Design an enzyme around this catalytic site. Structure first.
Site, PDB file in Angstrom:
ATOM      1  N   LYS A 207       0.149 -12.069  33.987  1.00 50.37           N
ATOM      2  CA  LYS A 207      -0.103 -11.256  35.162  1.00 50.37           C
ATOM      3  C   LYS A 207       0.184 -12.036  36.366  1.00 50.37           C
ATOM      4  O   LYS A 207       0.162 -13.269  36.535  1.00 50.37           O
ATOM      5  CB  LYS A 207      -1.276 -10.565  35.572  1.00 50.37           C
ATOM      6  CG  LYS A 207      -1.612  -9.475  34.410  1.00 50.37           C
ATOM      7  CD  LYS A 207      -2.308  -8.452  34.798  1.00 50.37           C
ATOM      8  CE  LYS A 207      -2.246  -7.023  33.770  1.00 50.37           C
ATOM      9  NZ  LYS A 207      -3.802  -6.719  33.406  1.00 50.37           N
ATOM     10  N   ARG A 241      -6.402  -8.493  25.364  1.00 47.46           N
ATOM     11  CA  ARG A 241      -5.212  -7.961  25.126  1.00 47.46           C
ATOM     12  C   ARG A 241      -4.020  -8.903  25.788  1.00 47.46           C
ATOM     13  O   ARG A 241      -3.777  -9.096  26.852  1.00 47.46           O
ATOM     14  CB  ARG A 241      -5.260  -6.582  26.022  1.00 47.46           C
ATOM     15  CG  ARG A 241      -3.716  -5.943  26.100  1.00 47.46           C
ATOM     16  CD  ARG A 241      -3.960  -4.649  27.188  1.00 47.46           C
ATOM     17  NE  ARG A 241      -2.743  -3.925  26.946  1.00 47.46           N
ATOM     18  CZ  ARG A 241      -1.647  -4.027  27.958  1.00 47.46           C
ATOM     19  NH1 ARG A 241      -1.550  -4.967  28.543  1.00 47.46           N
ATOM     20  NH2 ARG A 241      -0.655  -3.188  27.652  1.00 47.46           N
TER      21      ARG A 241
HETATM   22  N1  LIG Z   1      -7.023  -1.878  28.841  1.00 44.95           N
HETATM   23  C1  LIG Z   1      -5.777  -2.344  29.604  1.00 44.95           C
HETATM   24  N2  LIG Z   1      -4.847  -1.698  29.395  1.00 44.95           N
HETATM   25  C2  LIG Z   1      -3.762  -2.125  30.185  1.00 44.95           C
HETATM   26  N3  LIG Z   1      -2.559  -1.241  30.095  1.00 44.95           N
HETATM   27  C3  LIG Z   1      -3.620  -3.366  30.932  1.00 44.95           C
HETATM   28  N4  LIG Z   1      -2.503  -3.651  31.829  1.00 44.95           N
HETATM   29  O1  LIG Z   1      -2.148  -4.862  31.792  1.00 44.95           O
HETATM   30  C4  LIG Z   1      -5.070  -4.032  31.024  1.00 44.95           C
HETATM   31  O2  LIG Z   1      -5.076  -4.953  31.565  1.00 44.95           O
HETATM   32  N5  LIG Z   1      -5.874  -3.412  30.185  1.00 44.95           N
END
Ligand SMILES: Nc1nc(N)c(N=O)c(=O)[nH]1
Ligand SMILES: Nc1nc(N)c(N=O)c(=O)[nH]1
Lengths: 261, 261
Positions: A207, A241
C-alpha cells in the site's frame, strides 16, 4: 483463545493454530466476463497461491457487469482449487450471486454501510463477513477511538440483520480514509481492536503508506509488507491479506513459532 | 530513551533515531592473510553493505594466525569504507591488534568469560564492547532467569575491568547454548533484557532455529530472518546483526516508522 472454528461450508478454518493467509487473486480483465484467457489466468494463479501456502483466495469485482466478470471466476476457481473463496464486494446483489456461484466469505470494504442489505445476504447464506473500517471523510477527533466506534456501528448493522457473532471478522482498513501518518498510528495501536471480541484480518500488502516510509515503488514493497504482517501478527491478528503468498507465509510461520501460536 | 550516543572514535551512533544495522562481513580466506583476492573481496563487500544501508561492519576471525588474517582486512576496510568496524573475537590479544589496526567495537561471543583480559583491552582503548550470552553447557533451571544472571556476570567482569556503562552493549546469544525451543523462547521474552539498562544487539541471521521452524536450507532463510528482526525491533533492540543488509534495512526502517522510533 478462540473457542470456535471459522465455519465455511465445506472448509473449516481453525483460528488458533496459525496465522491464516488470504491470497489476493489477480483479476486482469479481458477487453471483451467469462472469456478463456481471464478465467484460465485467474485459475493458474489461484493454484500458484494454493501451492505457496494460502488458506483463502480473495476474488475482487456497474452492477450486472461486476457479476458477469466475477461469477465465472468463482465457478472455475471453487471447482479447480480446494480453498475457501472470499468475495470482495460492498454490493448486496454482487455478494448474493458470488455465494450462489460458490464463494464462502464476504469481504466488505464498507463494512455494511455502503449497502446494509449485504448483511442480510450474509445472515441468510450464513457466511462469515469481513467488516472493514472505512469512511467517506477524514475528520478524526481521535483516530483509534473513532475507528473502534465506526467498526462498532458496522457490527450493529451486521447483528441487527441476523449475523451471528461467530461469522464476524473485523479489519482496521489500513490505507482507507487515513493519511499516511494515521496508517502508521493504526499499525502501532492495532491490539486495541481485540477489545471488540472478534477475529482481526489485516490488509497492508503493497500500500502507498509503505512507499511513503520506504520511498519505493509498488513492486519494491516486499520487505515493508513483511514488517507490517509481522507487527500485525504480534499485535494479535488472525488473518493477513497479501499478494506475495510465498514470502508472507514464511514470515507468518516464523512469527507464529516465536509468539507461541 | 538513550540519554547518550554510542561513541566510536571518528563515528557516533545515535541510539534513538533508528535501528542500527550491523553488516556481517564475508571473510572467505585464501589457501595461502594479507593476499590480494581476500582483502579485495572483503572490501568490495564492505562497500556493497555500506551502500545498502549498514551502519557497522562486523569482521570475524590459532592466535597469531587469526591476527594475520584479520588485521589486513581491518586496515583496508577502515581505509576504504567510512563506517565503524566491530571485531568479532573473544581473544584479548586479537582484540588489542584489531583496534590498533583501526577497529571500533569489540564483539565478544563469550562475554568476557573466555578471556577476561579482553575487558581490560576494551577498558584501555575505551571502545564499546558487545557481551553475548553464551555458556559451555545447556543445563537451564530457568532459561530467561539464567540468561539475565549470566549476562550480569559478564557486566561485572567488564565493569571490574574499568569498562564504562556507556560502552556496554548486550546480546542474548540466539543460537548459542540453546536448543531450538530455547531459541524461540528467548525471542518471545527478549524485552526482559531491557531491565538491565543497556542497548541490545540481536543476531539471528540465517541460524538453524529458523530452519528448524521453516524447514528450509540456509540460503532459504530471508523471510524467517525478517520475522526475527521485526519481533526483535518490536521488543526493543537497538542493533540487528545481519547478512542480508538490503532487505533487513528495509524491514528495520518500516518497523521504526510503525513502532514510532
Ligand atoms: N478486507 C480487506 N479488503 C480489501 N479489499 C482491502 N484492500 O486493500 C483490505 O485491506 N482489506
Ligand atoms: N554479537 C554477536 N556476535 C556473533 N558472532 C553472533 N553470531 O551469530 C551473534 O549472534 N551475535
Amino acid at each position: 483463545k478462540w473457542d470456535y472454528d471459522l465455519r465455511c461450508g465445506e472448509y473449516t478454518l481453525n483460528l488458533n493454530e496459525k496465522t491464516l493467509i488470504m491470497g489476493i487473486l489477480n483479476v486482469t480483465p479481458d477487453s471483451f466476463g467469462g472469456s478463456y484467457n481471464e478465467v484460465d489466468a485467474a485459475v493458474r494463479h489461484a493454484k500458484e497461491m494454493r501451492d505457496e501456502g494460502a488458506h483463502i483466495i480473495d476474488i475482487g469485482g456497474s452492477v450486472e457487469e461486476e457479476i458477469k466478470r466475477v461469477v465465472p471466476m468463482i465457478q472455475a476457481v471453487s471447482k479447480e482449487v480446494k480453498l475457501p473463496i472470499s468475495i470482495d464486494t460492498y454490493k448486496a446483489e454482487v455478494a448474493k450471486q458470488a455465494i450462489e456461484a460458490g464463494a464462502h466469505i464476504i469481504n466488505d470494504i464498507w463494512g455494511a454501510k455502503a449497502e446494509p442489505k449485504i448483511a442480510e445476504v450474509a445472515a441468510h447464506y450464513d457466511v462469515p463477513i469481513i467488516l472493514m473500517h472505512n469512511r467517506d471523510n477524514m475528520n478524526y477527533r481521535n483516530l483509534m477511538a473513532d475507528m473502534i466506534a465506526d467498526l462498532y456501528d458496522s457490527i450493529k448493522i451486521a447483528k441487527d440483520a441476523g449475523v451471528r457473532d461467530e461469522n464476524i471478522i473485523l479489519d482496521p482498513g489500513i490505507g482507507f480514509a487515513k493519511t499516511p501518518e494515521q496508517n502508521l498510528e493504526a499499525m502501532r495501536n492495532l491490539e486495541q481492536l481485540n477489545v471488540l471480541g472478534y477475529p482481526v484480518l489485516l490488509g497492508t500488502s503493497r500500500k502507498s503508506f509503505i512507499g511513503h516510509v520506504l520511498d519505493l515503488p509498488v513492486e519494491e514493497r516486499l520487505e515493508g509488507t513483511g514488517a507490517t504482517v509481522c507487527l500485525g501478527i504480534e499485535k494479535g491478528c488472525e488473518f493477513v491479506r497479501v499478494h506475495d503468498v510465498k514470502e508472507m507465509s514464511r514470515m507468518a510461520k516464523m512469527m507464529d513459532a516465536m509468539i507461541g501460536k
